[PDB]
Structures are given as structure tokens and as C-alpha cells.
Amino acid sequence: MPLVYMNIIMAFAIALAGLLMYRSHLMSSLLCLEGMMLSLFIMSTLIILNTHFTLANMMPIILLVFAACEAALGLSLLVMVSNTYGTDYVQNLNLLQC
Template identity: 90%
Template sequence: TAFMVSLAGLLMYRSHLMSSLLCLEGMMLSLFVLATLTILNSHFTLASMMPIILLVFAACEAALGLSLLVMVSNTY
């Protein structure tokens, strides 16, 4: 699955920050798709906000990761 491929990429490219961030984004995207499809298939309307909350956390994680990347690249 996409989650396992992203996890393998994260484990392989630990020393490269940009590659690690891309792998984390791939993991979050696969979790978002899984959560969305699960909620759509189960017709569980009470949990319909969970994919949106996951997407918000992924955006915050991406913003923090990119700011760390800029901070590290400015010091070298």
C-alpha cells in the first residue's frame, strides 16, 4: 500500500530532511484517503469531520516541516 511505501521511504531517507517530509506527506495522504473511504462506506455521519481534522493536522505538519527546512538551510 501507499502507507507502507512511504514508511519504507521514510526509513531509507532519514538523513535527507526534504525526502523525509515528502514521505510523511505521503503517509498522511494515504491515511486521509483511508479515513475518507471508511467513513463513506460505513455511512457513519458522526465521524465525518475526522478526515478534515486529519487534513488540518497534515497542513500544520507540512508548514512546521518546511519552516524547519528553511531554518536549517539558512544556517549552512
């Protein structure tokens, strides 16, 4: 396992950790999710190209498409949340408590 794959997985772990920190700005949560899918795309593309799995060249595009669709949904949700409060701050969603 070369160092490039390790760097990509480290990048994904950093994006996931930053998503889990939640300083503020749920928009940053969506940004972290998109960084995660970008790292997934890059490493999956590198693995597939390297092993010459010709039919697997389908998979990255599919992934991209689906992930981007998810982003759209998320953005819509964000707007409505903002549409209630005027700002996308995380701490505004304190109505529901365990």
C-alpha cells in the same frame, strides 16, 4: 477486508519505508510524511463513507488540517537548517552523535 484497503496500507508502508531509507534531501522526508498523511486521509475517508458514519465525516478534514499545519512547521525547520548550511542534506546534521 477488500483489496483497496490493502493497497492503501501497502502505499502507506512504502511511504514509511522510503522515509526510513534517507538517501538524502530531508525535503524528501517531509514528502514521505505528506504521502503518509494522504494515504491516511484516503483510507479513513473510504472507511467512513462505506459504513455511513455521518458524524465521522468530521474526522478527515480535521486530520488534513492538522497534518498540513505540521507540514508548515516542518518546512520552517528545514529552512533554518538550510539557513545554516545552504543545503538540506541529511548528512550535514552529524554534529550530534550518540
